[PDB]
Amino acid sequence: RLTEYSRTLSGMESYCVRAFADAMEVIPSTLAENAGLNPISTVTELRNRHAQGEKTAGINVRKGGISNILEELVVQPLLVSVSALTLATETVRSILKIDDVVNT
Amino acid sequence: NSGMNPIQTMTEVRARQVKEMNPALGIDCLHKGTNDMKQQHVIETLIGKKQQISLATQMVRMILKIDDIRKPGESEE
Amino acid sequence: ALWDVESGQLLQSFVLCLDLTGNTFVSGGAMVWDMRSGQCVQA
Amino acid sequence: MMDVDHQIAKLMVELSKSQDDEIGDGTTGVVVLAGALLEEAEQLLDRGIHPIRIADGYEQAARVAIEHLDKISDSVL
Amino acid sequence: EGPLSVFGDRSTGETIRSQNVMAAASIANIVKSSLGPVGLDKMLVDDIGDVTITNDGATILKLLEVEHPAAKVLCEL
Amino acid sequence: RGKGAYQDRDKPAQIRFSNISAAKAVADAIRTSLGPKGMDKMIQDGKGDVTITNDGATILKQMQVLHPAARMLVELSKAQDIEAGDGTTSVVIIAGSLLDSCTKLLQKGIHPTIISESFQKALEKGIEILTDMSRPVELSDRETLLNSATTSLNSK
Amino acid sequence: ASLSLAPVNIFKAGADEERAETARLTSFIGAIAIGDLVKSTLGPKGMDKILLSSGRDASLMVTNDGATILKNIGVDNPAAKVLVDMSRVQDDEVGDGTTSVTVLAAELLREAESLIAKKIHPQTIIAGWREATKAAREALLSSAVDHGSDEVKFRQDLMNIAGTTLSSKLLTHHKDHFTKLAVEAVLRLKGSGNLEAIHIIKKLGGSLADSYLDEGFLLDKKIGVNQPKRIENAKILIANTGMDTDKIKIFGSRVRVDSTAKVAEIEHAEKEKMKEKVERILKHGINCFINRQLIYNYPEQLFGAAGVMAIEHADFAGVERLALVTGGEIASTFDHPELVKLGSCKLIEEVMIGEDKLIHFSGVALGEACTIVLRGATQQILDEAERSLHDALCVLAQTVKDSRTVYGGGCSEMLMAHAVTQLANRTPGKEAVAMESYAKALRMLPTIIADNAGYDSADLVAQLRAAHSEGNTTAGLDMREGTIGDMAILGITESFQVKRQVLLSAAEAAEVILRVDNIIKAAPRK
Amino acid sequence: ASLSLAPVNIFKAGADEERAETARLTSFIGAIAIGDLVKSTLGPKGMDKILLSSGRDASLMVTNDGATILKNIGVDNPAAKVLVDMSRVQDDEVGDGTTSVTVLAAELLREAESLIAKKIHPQTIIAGWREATKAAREALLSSAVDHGSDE
Amino acid sequence: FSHPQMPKKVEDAKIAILTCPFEPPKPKTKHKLDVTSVEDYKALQKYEKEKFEEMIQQIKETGANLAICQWGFDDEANHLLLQNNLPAVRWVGGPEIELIAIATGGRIVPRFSELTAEKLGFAGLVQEISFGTTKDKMLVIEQCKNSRAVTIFI
Ligand SMILES: Nc1ncnc2c1ncn2[C@@H]1O[C@H](COP(=O)(O)OP(=O)(O)O)[C@@H](O)[C@H]1O
Ligand SMILES: Nc1ncnc2c1ncn2[C@@H]1O[C@H](COP(=O)(O)OP(=O)(O)O)[C@@H](O)[C@H]1O
Ligand SMILES: [Mg+2]
Ligand SMILES: [Mg+2]
Ligand SMILES: [Mg+2]
């Protein structure tokens, strides 16, 4: 969705929003890598299935592929994801504002 | 190096190259007012570019294939 | 720092050595502090 | 002129020497191209691609680029 | 040393797994010869001449000086 | 027009690159312990104390990182633990990935303030998307609570 | 012959001295280094700095405040020490301006070095700078505008001043929300300058936009065991009594009996005395009891039996803030209940902020004491937000004291420099050159502001100079897109006190440093 | 990321490098120091220096010549070495003007530092200086007079 | 001023300069007071309370508006001073005590029982001065009748 949003934001900020989306893509790749699956193909399959319409699709470590993640009863509260995203964004902005290191 | 915005100028030049079929459009480093590098007479040998690409690719492949380093680590004087 | 022995709580935090009525004490590095006001009173 | 210990840095120095020996020009473009190639290979490796696959893709793309260079070349007297 | 910048040593993967298995095997081999009716006792000298002739595994593992974490895990087990 | 400000000082760029590299290194270090197939890390203190853990906040706190960006990442994981208590590993990975993208974004010639503002816009859009894709829950539904607890305990 | 460069040695081992060239060079290098360090953190597009402590704790601090940067650096250059003390004093006197005064002093000293290179006596430069400072001060005073009579315009000026102060800090992300927060917090002081009455609580986690100014008050203390955890229509009694085995203050007294039964009787008498103390306290008809010192187990058991909340160990600041917010009187004796005023609030309850529990006072009577909850992602973010809020509150309190305001964005510097140039154009001698250098530094300030944003600083400063010479006295830098605009329309306003203090302190320190022609150092202790 | 400020180290022990700000600062400091030293020996009222050798011979020289002063000093600043070589080559080509050329180079580099401080690309400064040098050379050539015909 | 809720400005202040802490008296000689019964404890508590009340009443009886001490005082005396509309300052240094006595034309009194109206100093204005955003406060005593001591504030 953020890739689409960046596509709708022609300008200089479109590149930054697309980079933001690509960075968000990291966690599924890490899950696939840890599960022993092929990361590139698994993430591509996830993206294709999500684009097709189904949004409850995730890594199925038990089966070894991609399926409806609600079938495996893998659910988490929205607060975890919202807080993680918000805190990470604020930390990134605060770090980006820094340009010098002074030793005391 | 010429003081222009890299991404913007490069994207504009690439779009112009795609639009009209002209592979001679490049970066106007000297600010002559034109991007057509053939008119500016910026010419370089074909074999030079081919050798650049070949050497870079072979060195990158050779470096990518090294997965272990065994250094003496003695830090001799 | 001065701590309450019975309750195990930090009464007030303010020094190689110090010495002390358990209200006015002097700390040397003089620095006399009064617990009734929590301020330096003599130097 | 550089005084380096890292073996990859010595490889880059030798790459520049090779470009100087064979062509005599473009000894700086080769290093920049190799650095960019390895920088892209870094993010390709972070996504779980075997470095041999990256090298093979780089070789295929280099072949395509060399053929394109042959296509878009011009002859001078 | 590197980009992580942690004041210490790091071992990852097969290296640390083999280290843990080696420590566990060392602890097992210490007491493996004292099992069953045809087992034999051991002398333990406590650096000041104190002698402990024992066959119990717990006594041997408590009296020993153990440093590796996995070895400590087996001793406390 | 043509040439803009020369930017005679390259030190700010070097500082930004070093900060990003440190954050990316921390994220790469803790990536291995993510998800149900993640593995625990042994951390031995300077005093000899030993801890085995998969919790991201505990891992970040135990190893005394030195680079300032790593310390800010540790504080970020601690804040995530305080506010949520779960996801202390995902947030550090997200921050590291964002700064890794910032590397190429800055290399392309984009001012850091523009990157930060665009990241804020993307954050707002992502919050909207995540809220849209979620579903309500009632505390009287024991099955959902059990599933959430099991999902939390899968990686441990 | 010089003192050091003489055949006979007159110094202890390790003591040296620096004559004309060396003294002036050391002073100028130190001042320029300090100014270059503190700058690039100036203006709306200034960046932050990371301060790594070299101590065992290795404290981490990212900040934009100039005074904070200059305090936590190991400085050995004496002129750099002078500039650091200047910045610290500027921070003490007013909130903002710590970076501006340092940069102005550094630019003045750079101009002084250039003038000295042109064979101009430093005393001539000092006289020229004194005249230039007089002219600039007169111009700045004449350009001041006051809106203290009108409440709506004064509130608009307060909003603009808070926004301008916060524009350079990490709070510029939520500038609007934080400006409203700071303005409300300052206005709740009811005209008092007590900045200690505003308490800032930093809680980790959450977003910066989640920060808020509580409508009542928040206390980080704890309630007793059997005491109620929720009081409606509370009647507060703030006290500063012992309540922990309150011994009779005759320190020469002792219990000297011949049996243990008498000892038991005496301890029962002590417990009865404490119970009578609690009864006298309860005679006031109260629901809540905040004591500055500790409350031991017996008094808290008595309070729980009485069913009244008893908050203990609220330090001097705590009891002062509670008295300000609830209107109570800090009482240490309870023999005249009619002479003691009781604090009042609509509701007392425990709130759950983050993972910590705090006592919340709602519907306070007076409210002349604020608590601000700051939420952030890192401890560094929280510290920087607290510092930025302190700057904003300090500037707002100063503006409340003195309502005269000037226009920021380089407008004040431009008009002062224009006045200095006008004075220099009718002055003979090298004093005119010194005045021109003074005006050059005044120009250099908004030049650095524009440089920090990556704009064409030279062209923008030339445009500002032309506009101010023409008569556009309100022209200034428009930092939204990099043009010039009307600072009155854009609402870029500052406190007149802050700008005047920056100007005067910078000129004074530059004059002080310029007078030195010999630096003599004693042998260090090490 | 630069070679020096990278997590991995790419240099020998004792080898280093100075990036944009540091390199420009070192060059400007060295050039300005050389120019300030050689000056004050310029013009009819210039004064002489004392060159006290630190070697075993401990040779003593008193000179007003810029090239002689510049060649007999141990300079580690590479830009100082460039200026010293310039003065030596000027002395080789013609017998006069070593102090003048060194001072002119130092003043030009000081102005270059001032221009760089104002966010001006060094290539722009170089182009402007080339145009200025052309104009000044043409003016000097037009200003010259000749009297070789008249004895 | 010792109490935070005490007024920050006194006009036509009649100052009582004192060198005795507002505390129960204690002999300099090594002394032990024996409590042998409940009646003794009650009498001691009553004596302490009455001493506090008596010293405050003695200070108030002279008509003084301001009280200046050298050795500080404790909570009960502070609250009684606030309750009786007597602004007070504690822990004032000896040289400062002498200068205040010289300027205000008042005598230095070593104990409350010796306090009289004729020993009170006079000051036209006693004020507490703030110094911006610094939290530090200072006290200014000026507008004296025929002050024979001056201070220069830089
Ligand atoms: N919105 C704005 N537009 C133009 N100039 C601004 C704006 N906000 C702040 N400034 C300028 O930035 C300068 C530096 O302010 P700041 O860095 O916040 O504190 P300090 O005055 O201590 O440096 C001020 O002199 C002010 O004139
Ligand atoms: N009598 C003079 N009047 C005015 N200028 C002079 C006179 N003699 C020499 N000069 C100037 O002094 C300058 C420097 O000459 P000098 O000090 O000998 O060092 P150098 O010739 O090595 O540069 C010359 O450019 C010349 O124009
Ligand atoms: Mg070439
Ligand atoms: Mg989890
Ligand atoms: Mg400010």
Coordinates of N, CA, C and O in Angstrom, one line a residue, chain F residues 3 6 8-11 14 17, chain H residues 1-2 21 24 116 119 121-122:
Chain F
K3 N 24.7 25.6 -10.7 CA 25.3 25.1 -9.4 C 24.6 25.7 -8.2 O 24.2 26.9 -8.2
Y6 N 27.7 24.9 -2.4 CA 28.8 24.0 -2.6 C 28.8 22.9 -1.5 O 29.2 21.7 -1.8
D8 N 30.7 22.8 1.5 CA 32.1 22.5 1.7 C 32.4 21.5 2.8 O 33.5 21.0 3.0
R9 N 31.4 21.3 3.7 CA 31.6 20.4 4.8 C 31.0 19.0 4.5 O 29.8 18.9 4.3
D10 N 31.8 18.0 4.5 CA 31.4 16.6 4.3 C 31.3 15.8 5.6 O 30.7 14.7 5.6
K11 N 31.7 16.4 6.7 CA 31.6 15.7 8.0 C 30.2 15.4 8.4 O 30.0 14.3 8.9
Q14 N 29.4 12.1 6.8 CA 30.1 11.0 7.4 C 29.5 10.6 8.7 O 29.4 9.4 9.0
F17 N 26.3 8.7 7.8 CA 26.7 7.3 7.3 C 27.1 6.4 8.4 O 26.7 5.2 8.5
Chain H
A1 N 30.8 6.8 3.0 CA 31.7 6.6 4.1 C 33.2 6.7 3.6 O 33.5 6.1 2.6
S2 N 34.0 7.5 4.3 CA 35.4 7.7 3.9 C 36.2 6.5 4.3 O 35.8 5.7 5.1
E21 N 37.1 19.1 4.3 CA 37.4 20.2 5.2 C 38.9 20.2 5.7 O 39.6 21.2 5.7
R24 N 41.4 21.0 2.8 CA 41.4 22.4 2.5 C 42.0 23.2 3.6 O 42.8 24.2 3.3
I116 N 35.5 30.0 -0.5 CA 35.0 28.6 -0.1 C 34.0 28.8 1.1 O 33.0 28.1 1.2
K119 N 30.3 29.3 0.3 CA 29.6 28.3 -0.5 C 29.8 28.5 -2.0 O 28.8 28.7 -2.7
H121 N 31.8 26.8 -5.3 CA 32.5 25.6 -5.7 C 33.9 26.0 -6.2 O 34.1 27.1 -6.9
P122 N 35.0 25.3 -5.8 CA 36.3 25.7 -6.2 C 36.5 25.7 -7.7 O 37.4 26.4 -8.2

